[PDB]
Amino acid sequence: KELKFLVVDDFSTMRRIVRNLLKELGFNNVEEAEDGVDALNKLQAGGYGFVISDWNMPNMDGLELLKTIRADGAMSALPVLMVTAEADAENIKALAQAGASGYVVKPFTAATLEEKLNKIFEKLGM
Amino acid sequence: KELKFLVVDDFSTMRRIVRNLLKELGFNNVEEAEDGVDALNKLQAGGYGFVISDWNMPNMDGLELLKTIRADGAMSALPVLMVTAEADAENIKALAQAGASGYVVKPFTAATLEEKLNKIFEKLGM
Amino acid sequence: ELKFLVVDDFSTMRRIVRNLLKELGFNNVEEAEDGVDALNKLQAGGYGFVISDWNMPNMDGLELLKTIRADGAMSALPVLMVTAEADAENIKALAQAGASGYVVKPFTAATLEEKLNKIFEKLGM
Amino acid sequence: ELKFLVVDDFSTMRRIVRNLLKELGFNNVEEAEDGVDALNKLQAGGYGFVISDWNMPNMDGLELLKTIRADGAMSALPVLMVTAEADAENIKALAQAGASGYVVKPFTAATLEEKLNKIFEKLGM
């Protein structure tokens, strides 16, 4: 619950929605970023334990952000939950190939988010 | 607070000095490790919330231990304070790139250790 | 349109750069995975701009830049170096080796465009 | 002087193993990133010892060991397998595949030395 989250999306409203659903679940340590670039700049500052990122964003999208994090020795194993608007078979496979910790289709509820977070925490042993 | 610390250094005298300075600051939950291998073995057991490690150690030194911790899913965000003999610009940049939560030059006082601890606590949202 | 050669051993970064260039209207882009691979392609001629990362195996960015500048057949080729750290040390070596400019990664399309615009303007392009 | 090849996709671990060998007096060490890279490297020739991690992309440790043993030119090559756990099942598989020995990471220079000496003795080296 004290874990530091970074919520990434270029639409402020969707970021505020995710931040509040997190709050609803008991997670109050949350930061926000506008795209893959802004996010990497924040993650390099350190302290983050979980990233929630949207699939489509300007400059550097979710998949590109994920691949970059996975290749960085300072944060290679950082949990990344990808938010997508549709669960496309290719997408799901791409996400799997790229090392995503999991994915969630939007719009989602606090309940769907909770189940997704618990599965990831268990798999990683947190 | 009773955050569980792991103090890592091959010199028993330094480990005992750091443990005592933490006691002076109010942290009484503290374990010790002799080098990075021993530390990793302990961290695998889980339960730790902060690591203070010396730069120079046989088998696996501070930087190698830090890099190994950051490559682990659960310990991605585990705070790691690196203790070093001199604040050399090369070391510091290496530390930052590897994801160290901070560093402190020895010998240090309880006051200095408290300042470093607070900066890292603020950085993580604790 | 101006043919670009994007060089980086990290395939993901090459795609990001190629995407941003296309966003800026440059569709004539090729990729190379290191300095040696880049030089093999540059030999054919036809390239008008090179964007290279600083750290690559076989031949790194600084070494690639020096080789280009020393080659009479392409000594004035514009080269934009991508770096992770805007270290004053690095900036010195880059200018000394003759980089047309540099950009720190990660970067946005806007920053890339500004960097390109500064080089184009300087060369009268 | 025996030429070692250290294989692991985690670069930090390759450097650690290389540092331990140097400490034990073994200075002739090369590195590979996975099973496929290792096999390509073994082609250049002159290798006398392989230390590989159990889990790597493209070709893991078990598959690398199996390939080495199925190649007549290198069927006698010593192979020390590094694992995260001494799972008896894994140890059974390692014995079946012809591993020279195994070591659980993380490990110390003393443990490594003990493992290498055991293999050396057993191999008449």
Swiss-Prot record, chains A, B:
GO cellular component, one term: cytoplasm
Alphabetical list of CDD domains matching this protein: REC_CheY_CheY3
Keywords tagged on the record: Acetylation, Chemotaxis, Cytoplasm, Flagellar rotation, Magnesium, Metal-binding, Phosphoprotein, Two-component regulatory system
Cleaved signal peptide residues: none
Gene Ontology MF term list: metal ion binding
GO biological processes: archaeal or bacterial-type flagellum-dependent cell motility; chemotaxis; phosphorelay signal transduction system
Cofactor(s) named in the record: Mg(2+)
InterPro entries referenced in this protein's UniProt entry, alphabetically: CheY-like_superfamily, Sig_transdc_resp-reg_receiver, ST_Response_Regulator
Cofactor binding description: Binds 1 Mg(2+) ion per subunit.
Post-translation changes: Phosphorylated by CheA or acetylated by acetyl-CoA synthetase, depending on which acetate metabolism pathway is available.
Modified residues (N6-acetyllysine): A89, K106
PANTHER family found in the cross-reference section: TWO-COMPONENT RESPONSE REGULATOR (PTHR43228), TWO-COMPONENT RESPONSE REGULATOR ARR22 (PTHR43228:SF1)
Function, as annotated: Involved in the transmission of sensory signals from the chemoreceptors to the flagellar motors. In its active (phosphorylated or acetylated) form, CheY exhibits enhanced binding to a switch component, FliM, at the flagellar motor which induces a change from counterclockwise to clockwise flagellar rotation.
Protein name: Chemotaxis protein CheY
Species the sequence originates in: Shigella flexneri
Gene, per the UniProt record: cheY
